[PDB]
């Protein structure tokens, strides 16, 4: 075997491992990480209306028929296969309208226990669960349940684009379907030759810069706790409040979004006594390295570990901070930050191994609570997977803003969270409002309570 150049990917429908995403990875390879809410199945219910129960599975049997990017199943075998051919449908219709308001409870109380328990066919790689609610007045949900790489971000951007072009009866300009995850680690894993050795070097920088992953108390040992419980609580503050901060921030010479999610973010883990910690953002780069990519959504997701340098103190120092460490970061967009933490559980200096992600994505839709979704309204869901332990997810509807955050129950006393946001809910009041918080330590807002001065 002579000593030769390593090839690219020649495995173009031959079934491939997943992406260098070792979070996504983990989480598929190893199922019923009980923290981590068992897996990371998240379910999307869009109340509305799109079409006919007969229409919509005819319309899954057609795409399926093709081959979108996003034709990708998991085989527990740790590789990812993408089938050209039509798998199955399996919509079952669900009658609340031809039915009484007992149907109703009987079916979404049903569904709940059934989405907790439901045995996906990932046992044999293709996997999928469609629940289709059929509502009083002529009204519909569609609730899709899944648990594998064929959901994501990008997966969704991609599918509720073509999805209301399909249900409108629109034909689009056809998109090179000739892409799949294969064609991106084909390119990924060739370049990855040389630059693995900059990639290496400059996520172990930040490898040894960064402490123990954040410390927060757990009621009880994960090992113990088989069942979990996900309690998420929604928030809709004031327009004015939010884009006041959002507008200071903007004003102040630092990102607007990031500014609100990581004032929260930060402080919430930092309580443990981590002055310096590394929170996660999800970050949209799309790359366009290919002209067929830069149409198509399968890179976009790449999540970012932003390590804060104190909190407690002026917001100068705090911001300046954040901002001058995200532009190295923003040379790090190389690859995904993911390879930064699998250096960090190489170190071995995980006391938890998991950071804080959020999301803050504002100038939505003004009509739907969801810009996502056009065709119906979706309810707040599950976001607690294996990667995730703690969720910050920030919406946009009338301008307002719909804050969701998703925590492990059993584990996060919500009174200890609440003091936490109450130092939030101040500081955001104050420094929007006043440039007098500027010059205050923010030490004053969450160490310290009872008014405080």
Excluded at 25 to 34: A, D, F, H, N, S
Excluded at 234 to 259: D, K, L, Q
């Amino acid at each position: 075997m002579p000593d030769e150049s390593s090839w690219p990917n020649m495995t173009e429908s031959t079934p491939f491992p997943l992406t260098p995403v070792q979070h996504a990875y983990l989480t598929g390879r190893m199922p019923g990480q009980t923290l981590g809410g068992v897996g990371c199945h998240l379910y999307q219910e869009f109340e509305g209306h799109c079409l006919t129960a007969s229409q919509l599975e005819q319309a899954i049997t057609t795409l399926l028929q093709r081959h979108p990017m996003l034709h990708i199943a998991f085989r527990p075998d740790g590789q990812q296969v993408w089938l050209p051919q039509p798998y199955w449908n399996g919509v079952t219709v669900h009658d609340l309208r031809h039915n009484d308001a007992e149907s109703r409870q009987a079916y979404l109380d049903a569904l709940r226990q059934r989405l907790s328990h439901r045995l996906l066919r990932v046992e044999i790689g293709e996997t999928f669960d469609f629940q289709l609610t059929l509502l009083p007045d002529n009204r519909h949900r569609l609730h899709v349940n899944i648990d594998l790489l064929i959901m994501d971000a990008s997966s969704f951007t991609l599918f509720f684009d073509e999805l209301n072009a399909l249900l409108a009866g629109e034909s689009l300009p056809a998109i090179d379907t000739r892409y799949d995850f294969r064609s991106y680690l084909l390119h990924q894993q060739k370049i990855n030759q040389p630059l693995r050795d900059d990639a290496r070097a400059y996520w172990l920088a930040k490898a040894s810069t960064l402490p123990p992953a954040p410390v927060l108390p757990l009621a009880c040992e994960p090992a113990t706790l088989r069942e979990v419980r996900n309690t998420r609580r929604r928030m809709i503050v004031p327009a004015t409040r939010w884009h006041a901060f959002s507008n200071r921030a903007g004003e102040y010479g630092v990102t607007p979004t990031m500014a609100l999610a990581t004032c929260f973010s930060a402080v919430l883990a930092r309580w443990g006594g981590l002055t310096r910690l590394l929170l996660n953002i999800t970050l949209f780069d799309r790359q366009p390295l290919h002209p067929a990519v830069g149409a198509m959504l399968a890179d976009f997701t790449n999540i970012l570990l932003l390590d804060t340098a104190c909190d407690g103190d002026t917001v100068s120092n705090l911001a300046r901070k954040n901002q001058l460490t995200f532009t190295e970061d923003w040379e790090h967009r190389h690859w995904s930050g993911v390879e930064l933490l699998r250096e960090l559980k190489r170190q071995q200096r995980y006391p938890h191994g998991a950071p804080v992600v959020f999301t803050s994505n504002l100038g939505r839709s003004l009509y739907s609570s969801r810009a996502e979704s056009p065709l119906g309204e979706p309810e707040w869901g599950i976001s607690q997977t294996p990667q995730v332990w703690i969720d910050h997810l920030a919406f946009e509807h009338h301008g307002e803003v719909w804050l969701q955050w998703d925590s492990n129950d059993a584990l996060f006393p919500p009174a200890l969270v609440e003091t936490l946001f109450d130092a939030y809910c101040q500081l955001i009041n104050q420094l929007c409002d006043d440039e007098s918080a500027w010059q205050k330590p923010f030490a004053d807002m969450l160490e310290h309570h009872h008014h405080h001065h």
